[PDB]
Design a protein around this ligand. Structure first.
Ligand SMILES: CC(C)(COP(=O)(O)OP(=O)(O)OC[C@H]1O[C@@H](n2cnc3c(N)ncnc32)[C@H](O)[C@@H]1OP(=O)(O)O)[C@@H](O)C(=O)NCCC(=O)NCCS
Ligand SMILES: CC(C)(COP(=O)(O)OP(=O)(O)OC[C@H]1O[C@@H](n2cnc3c(N)ncnc32)[C@H](O)[C@@H]1OP(=O)(O)O)[C@@H](O)C(=O)NCCC(=O)NCCS
Lengths: 388, 287, 388, 287
């Protein structure tokens, strides 16, 4: 899960890393009052949404009057911010971070992820701050410096110094940089992060390092042992259906298309989406039923997939699982009636009672085709949305 | 076959829990030589007609098992796996889903240093049709045969199992490397085993978005795999930077798309198939 | 450095491990007041000295009246406690630990050291608590259970459970034991301990684990990063000369003998002691001059070695070092006069100006023999104390 | 000779500090191929006529040095050593005294896994008389020769150097394994190197109280060392449970006394000498 910039900065502060003085504000009044608490302006005001590119979308402004802070807060609170990193629906702005302006001398990049190829937490730094790290990696790889945290020793100061020197830092900036590396590495390990990105890590004109932005991603598989992070989850930043799906043991990711997919298995879910795409269809979503395809779960699955108005048909692809094919068929039937599924449903069943489950579907009289295998299933759902 | 065979003696950690029980029952019915289980606190009892031990070392001393399958909730896996490595278990199959990446980061380093093989986590398991079944896969779709299967996905594996059984090729061994970002074993590890296994005449490699194990496997196959390989990568239509079910099914930093993996495999001379329904057809072609 | 039992128990408490309710008392009044703060007696009163075997020496009593607590405190405060683990001079009792009585059902042993053979922190547990762990290891090794902390993973719960089950613990005692293992392992690593010993780790009649005693040893090389431990040092528990020597960069350990030894080098110091012993002498001390054999340091060295009345001669054995032999000779001469060294001194010098330094000694007229090599040096100091 | 020779290129970490400077000057005068040094913050300067680098990797890339000697205060050693291992240095000689045991516990595991050899810490160093000197020993007492010396003590080593030089045997290489409880290399490691070194005809093994490296070396020598070995153990008169200078010179749990070590070495057929003054005589006997 992602954290807001302000939450990332609170965490940094907690680890003694530096960030501008700032206040997360939920009302324009709090935002304007932040000004004098911060001090002399100008002040940076920032919409807090998980997505990046807020600057390009107008969600980050440097203003110089309480009146402007308030106007910006009034403009954004409760509104959705669309950036190149959110879908066209953007993300709700429920907090405006108001922080002190920072005198920027230079912008650096410092970040860390779990590198799967080397199977290590890898920190990377670059003098190319303020730019998407991907762009810099593509074009000036030689400008990206990396160190892998050694699982046996924990992060070491020489690694922080290595990056610091490769960035051409010198004097106290080397120690400051090393300290930031050590703290961020420590946060990464202790809070089970999957991602840290300080872009930009700024060298201020006064000669100090400061985290001007912060993007933190937590490993969701570790939240059971990260109670603090657990509470920081902001569900408003995600499609609410994902959380609904999850509390029902379904993994749902909405897509652009119109052919809903309900499959047991992440791999099969993606494969099913791909095969639907291959046969001319446009998958509307990924939905891995994971959990036992019970009547209740399948019903929820439909409710969730169907909450998307664009869905014109639903392809159910179930291979195996803990529920016999005929029970799944009964459940699909119950879901269809009970949810008032008014779209055509194509079903591909494999396992015990595949053909009997198929019969039950065929005999229900509901608009549900039992397909004969994958390809057929794909072709049929594709055909089922023809004209819709 | 690789990894397991009719002689593999297996203990189950988390033996008395729901999944451990249910799937050990399945392994037992399949004829897998389950010889015991481990559930701290229930040592000395018997379950599914087998001895339950408090620790893996007790289990190993008592049964001589070289393989352990794990059905322990994610919070305790690192502990379970490290225990098994410490008890001398040489093959660990970790079914468990949800293990923190950082835990696996450390476990992987341990496994490699101790020379212990782990399949998983978040895997349906391993099955050598007709000889040994460890995991949650349905055993009545398999057919003792010649195709080795490695996959980051359980369900896609099943599709490929269905196809290789329907075409009569059958399977030598099916290995789910699991859907996590840092598995205990990767494609390259399993590929090398299939290349060296006389019973395996062809390999089906099934991958998906995220990471670069497939791309690396591609380079490996080109230079070290002589047997024909049929590849399938799921997630061509997956958005970037979004987890698609599996913790490992996420395209980070725009890298690791399905297309890049197909491309990489094509360039290494692997027979790829755009539709998961055509794996059997592609094998017929190369066999 | 060693910690007092009460300090060990405070640390355990800090790590959520359990110890009897107790108060460290510096006056009989504090000791008696501890009684009602603890509750209903009887109460265990314990002299706090670093050495073990306090029980056998009368330093641990279970009393049942405030009057007895006070009498025991009055009896021991400011007095020295001699145990089989201290020299005949004992250790000063400046604190009496007054704690709640514990209903003992069973005594176990749990301890940890850095095992040099396996190069791991090794925890060991035994059902044989209340007995010197060495005795149990000698006679019933099969009753000592061990686990090595893996540097890569940190202590793991299965290791705590392994020991717990080998101790035949069951039910909640297994979890309690595992928790104690995890906490003590964590303390070991975080505080840079060299040693932990809970003897006895008690299973109370109420069915709980409790640390009835605690012996903690800190790695002195790590005190620079253990500020809390640093402050807990109780110098009264050691021969004050060791600390004096150390602040002068000398390593001094008093022995029984009468031939003082001043050598540069730990190995040479021990070898010199051994060669003096081999040639019929009895070394009075170990003193590794380490630091530059300057006049000041050598002078201190003599003051320290000579503060022991039993010393009848001093053998100085200097091989190498950062100071030329002739300067060392001048310093030995200055020390001898200035310290008023009134005992014979035998000197063995090797290095630059060995023979000239020897000449300077011979020409000083002070009672200092320059020896010709090691064996000779030994024989001569031995002979020098003949009759004294 | 072992470990180092006239071709060994060495960098010094802590190069610009007092001891690093002073002893690099000595190494330089001896003809040791010091090619550079590392002091974070002083990269790009020159010291003792050699380049100073900010990091060991810079030093290694610039000079090709395979060995590093460390004169870095104890609090920063773990960091220094791990840096050197990371920079590809294959031989680390750590002079530093006072390194926390727990730091060395971890460093040792690292060294062994990375295949990096470390001599030390708390060691006078290593010297192959006539070819290479790394450390703080006085080089004018040595004589290129045939006796290999391994010791947990610098001063005792010198005594043995004096004797083997006086008897004309000379030294192949003198290795101080250092006085810490967990050294980077132990007797067995160095012994094997001497056994395999043609230039070494006899070995002087000098130990002291504490631990069991000597006892283990004894068993090793009996079965794998054919060259004559003369042993000397200091601390026969040391009290138990008291540090005698060296952090490793302490008898813990009544184990590791000098007598036990002499006994163990005697039983393995090693020529031991009760007086440190008789090492030269004992070598004459076995040569
Ligand atoms: C591991 C998983 C299957 C466990 O689920 P589960 O069986 O319902 O969990 P339960 O609590 O019933 O059983 C777990 C058992 O492990 C035991 N356990 C806990 N820690 C243990 C340890 N260190 N060693 C051994 N057993 C341990 C518990 O005691 C419990 O047994 P008990 O009920 O006898 O006390 C589940 O968390 C999971 O990961 N499911 C997804 C599996 C999956 O889909 N994989 C990918 C397929 S492609
Ligand atoms: C290591 C030891 C020699 C250092 O002492 P020292 O030279 O007086 O210490 P100094 O502070 O003068 O020099 C240390 C240098 O290391 C540098 N340093 C610190 N961390 C460093 C690192 N990670 N990498 C490289 N250099 C580092 C410092 O910058 C300092 O140099 P500078 O003065 O140019 O800034 C000393 O602490 C020690 O262990 N002495 C005992 C040696 C011994 O007796 N061994 C056993 C003999 S048998």
């Amino acid at each position: 899960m992602n954290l807001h910039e302000y939450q990332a900065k609170q965490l940094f502060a907690r680890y003694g890393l530096p960030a501008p003085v700032g206040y997360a504000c939920t009302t324009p009044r709090e935002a304007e009052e932040a000004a004098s608490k911060i001090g002399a302006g100008p002040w940076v005001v920032k919409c807090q949404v998980h997505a990046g590119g807020r600057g390009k979308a107008g969600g980050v402004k440097v203003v110089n009057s309480k009146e402007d802070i308030r106007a910006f807060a009034e403009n954004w609170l409760g509104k959705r911010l669309v950036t190149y990193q959110t879908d066209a629906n953007g993300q709700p702005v429920n907090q405006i971070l108001v922080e002190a302006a920072t005198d920027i001398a230079k912008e650096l990049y410092l970040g860390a992820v779990v590198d799967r190829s080397s199977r290590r937490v890898v920190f990377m730094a670059s003098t190319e701050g303020g730019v998407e790290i991907e762009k810099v990696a593509e074009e000036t790889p030689h400008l990206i410096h990396k160190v892998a945290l050694d699982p046996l020793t924990g992060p070491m100061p020489y690694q922080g110094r290595e990056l610091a020197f490769k960035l051409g830092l010198e004097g106290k900036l080397v120690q400051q940089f090393t300290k930031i590396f050590m703290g961020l590495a420590t946060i990464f390990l202790e809070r089970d992060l999957a991602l840290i990105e300080i872009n930009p890590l700024v060298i201020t004109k006064q000669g100090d390092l400061i985290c001007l932005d912060g993007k933190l991603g937590a490993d969701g598989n570790a939240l059971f042992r990260q109670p603090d992070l657990r509470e920081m989850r902001d569900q408003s930043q995600e499609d609410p259906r994902e959380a609904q799906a999850a509390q029902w043991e379904l993994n749902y990711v909405a897509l652009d298309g119109n052919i809903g997919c309900m499959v047991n298995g992440a791999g099969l879910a993606m494969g099913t989406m791909d095969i639907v795409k291959l046969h001319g269809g446009e998958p509307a979503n990924f939905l891995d039923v994971g959990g036992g395809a019970t009547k209740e779960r399948v019903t929820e699955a439909f409710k969730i997939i169907l909450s998307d108005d664009k869905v014109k048909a639903v392809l159910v692809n179930i291979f195996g699982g803990i529920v016999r094919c005929d029970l799944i068929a009964d459940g699909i039937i119950g879901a269809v009636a009970e949810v008032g599924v008014n779209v055509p449903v194509v079903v591909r069943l494999e396992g015990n009672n595949a053909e009997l489950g198929a019969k039950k579907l065929a005999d229900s009289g509901l608009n549900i085709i039992a397909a004969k295998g994958l390809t057929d299933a794909a072709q049929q759902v594709v055909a089922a949305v023809e004209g819709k | 076959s690789i990894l397991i065979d009719k002689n593999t003696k297996v203990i189950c950690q988390g033996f008395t829990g729901s999944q451990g029980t249910f799937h050990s029952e399945q392994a037992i019915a399949y004829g897998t030589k389950m010889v015991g289980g481990v559930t701290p606190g229930k040592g000395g009892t018997t379950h599914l007609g087998l001895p339950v031990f408090n620790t893996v070392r007790e289990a190993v001393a008592a049964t001589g098992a070289t393989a352990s399958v794990i059905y322990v909730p994610a919070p305790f896996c690192k502990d379970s796996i490290l225990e098994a490595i410490d008890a001398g278990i040489k093959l660990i199959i970790t079914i468990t889903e949800g293990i923190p990446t950082l835990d696996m980061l450390t476990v992987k380093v341990k496994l490699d240093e101790a020379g212990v093989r782990m399949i998983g986590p978040n895997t349906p398991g391993v099955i050598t049709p007709g000889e040994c079944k460890i995991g949650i896969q349905p055993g009545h779709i398999h057919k003792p045969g010649k195709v080795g299967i490695v996959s980051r996905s359980g369900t896609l594996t099943y599709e490929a199992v269905k196809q290789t059984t329907d075409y009569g090729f059958g399977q030598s061994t099916c290995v789910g490397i699991g859907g996590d970002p840092i598995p205990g074993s990767n494609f390259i590890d399993i590929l090398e085993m299939f290349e060296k296994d006389p019973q395996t005449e062809a390999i089906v490699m099934i991958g998906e978005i995220g990471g670069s194990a497939e791309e690396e496997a591609a380079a490996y196959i080109k230079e070290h795999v002589t047997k024909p390989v049929v590849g399938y990568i799921a997630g061509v239509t997956a958005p970037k930077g979004k987890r698609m079910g599996h913790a490992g099914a996420i395209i980070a930093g725009g890298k690791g798309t399905a297309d890049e993996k197909f491309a990489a495999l094509e360039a290494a001379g692997v027979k790829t198939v755009r539709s998961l329904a055509d794996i059997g057809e592609a094998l017929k072609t190369v066999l």
